[PDB]
Design a binder for this molecule. Structure first.
Ligand code: O62
Lengths: 11, 229
């Protein structure tokens, strides 16, 4: 769940 | 007088609040594009999705945010997104920012499939808050403060959030006492918005449903942050 949010948070 | 340990916070924060920014190629569309209910909506969608990216970046840079439970970061992000947007848009209308085309942008908002029940309160909020003559720092602090709200739904360590929010509130208050010695109730007026903003989440969830049933096009990002199947 929340692929995009997590991703942005890790970039 | 503001402390050193505080003046450093406000600066790092004030720093982030001006670092990122919405692309001119996008913001120009408030002006150029045609003015139809479809084009208006599409542009408004574009704005939201990009802002969401700016929010994450900003929020991340918030002191201590990253030490938080990852499940709590999502909850905070998904919880303050809309409220942050209202503030940014308020600022736009209020500061009459050039890259805002306020009048035109209000045009597109007024005609994007938004129910009247929602448009009115939306702008009333805009008018009353504008009349607070907020300094960019006030907007910035209320934002960070909006983002770091402990009492957000689905939050595990609400105590951990408070610990992050308290420091900002005071910085905001300290400033209120400094630049607004004449009027003591300013700070409390600022906090009032926090409540006004909350009100809008109920409304927003409604509009999402409305648009949704009308096969309205959102984005993978917006759908995520706002839980839309
Ligand atoms: C999905 C779409 C259709 C949508 O649904 N509800 C809304 C809505 C509305 Cl109508 C009113 C209040 C809150 C929300 Cl959430 C929106 C559109 O929501 C938005 C969100 C953000 C911006 C924006 C942010 C920053 C900037 C900046 C800058 O600060 O860099 C510069 C220039 C323009 C800028 C515009 C505009 C509209």
């Amino acid at each position: 769940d929340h692929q995009l949010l997590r991703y942005l948070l890790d970039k | 007088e503001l402390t050193p340990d505080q003046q450093t916070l406000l600066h790092f924060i004030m720093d982030s609040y001006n670092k990122q920014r919405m692309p001119q190629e996008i913001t120009n569309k408030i002006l150029k594009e045609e003015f139809s209910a479809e084009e208006n909506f599409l542009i408004l969608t574009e704005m939201a999705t990009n802002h969401v990216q700016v929010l994450v970046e900003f929020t991340k840079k918030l002191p201590g945010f990253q030490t938080l439970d990852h499940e709590d970061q999502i909850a905070l992000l998904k919880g303050s997104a809309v409220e942050a947007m209202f503030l940014r848009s308020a600022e736009i209308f209020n500061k009459k920012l050039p890259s805002g085309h306020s009048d035109l942008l209000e045009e597109r908002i007024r005609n994007s499939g938004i129910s009247d029940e929602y448009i009115t309160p939306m702008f009333s909020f805009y008018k009353s808050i504008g009349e607070l003559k907020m300094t960019q720092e006030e907007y910035a602090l209320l934002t960070a403060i909006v983002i770091l709200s402990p009492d957000r739904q689905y939050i595990k360590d609400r105590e951990a959030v408070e610990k992050l929010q308290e420091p900002l509130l005071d910085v905001l208050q300290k400033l209120c006492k400094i630049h607004q010695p004449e009027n003591p109730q300013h700070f409390a007026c600022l906090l009032g918005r926090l409540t006004e903003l909350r009100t809008f989440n109920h409304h927003h969830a409604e509009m999402l449903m409305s648009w949704r049933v009308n096969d309205h096009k959102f984005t993978p990002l917006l759908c995520e942050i706002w839980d839309v199947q």
